[PDB]
Amino acid sequence: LYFQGMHPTIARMQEVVAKGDESLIHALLAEDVRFMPPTYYKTWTGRDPVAAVLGHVGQVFSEFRYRRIMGEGKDWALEFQCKVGELDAVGVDLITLNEGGLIQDFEVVMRPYKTVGALRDAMNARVMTDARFLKYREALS
Template sequence: MKSFRQAVEAGDHAAVEALLAEDVVFTSPVAFRPYPGKAITAAILRGVTRVFTDFRYVREIVGADGRDQALVFTAKVGDREINGCDFLHFDEDGLIDDFTVMVRPLSAAQALSAAMGAQFDRIAAEAAGGDRNSGG
């Protein structure tokens, strides 16, 4: 099985989704409430790939027991440079059960919020079982 980082860097949406636990909770840097569930989390992550350009992980930090991981990234949202971190927790089966994203600076977070807001109807449709394979 690919690691999460390998799957993201390869643009392998199916492998990313396969690494998510059914009860994963996704905490967005731009939404007040977390999103529970594999379908919505996978759809959000596909949406992010349509919004980010020049995405790359620049550092990986792994907890002593291997169940916590922080992946530091850079990307662009429109003309804004964004820095962020994906905080992952893996359950006893090796699946991601908690996924939190933090980003900076504020101007880039605001650009991300607007870009993801524009994607949200499509994200909701994908999560409900619509077109899941139309990455970008």
């Protein structure tokens, strides 16, 4: 009916990425998924480290909601609005799905500059504190 053009992974991602539930995020990611954050021009590779990073991003954000879900087949752009503390933010999750329907590339773009700076500072604190990231450091390139 109205949702014929919606890919199931994209539908499932909306309900899970918002909440930042790491266990639920893991199942949607390709084994060698590439996550590119809005902060650094780097790439986190692997479902285990990427799910952990996304869990932390979800924790930092408040008042999170998607606004527009745009795309078809394997190429999607999920527009969202949220806050980082008292600062407003708008962003897009750029998703590329593989043949198996799992998230292969997940690239995040955002606005405004000041809120991205606040996100970067919050994420530096979380990643450094989370002792599991001693192992996950190797996944960043």
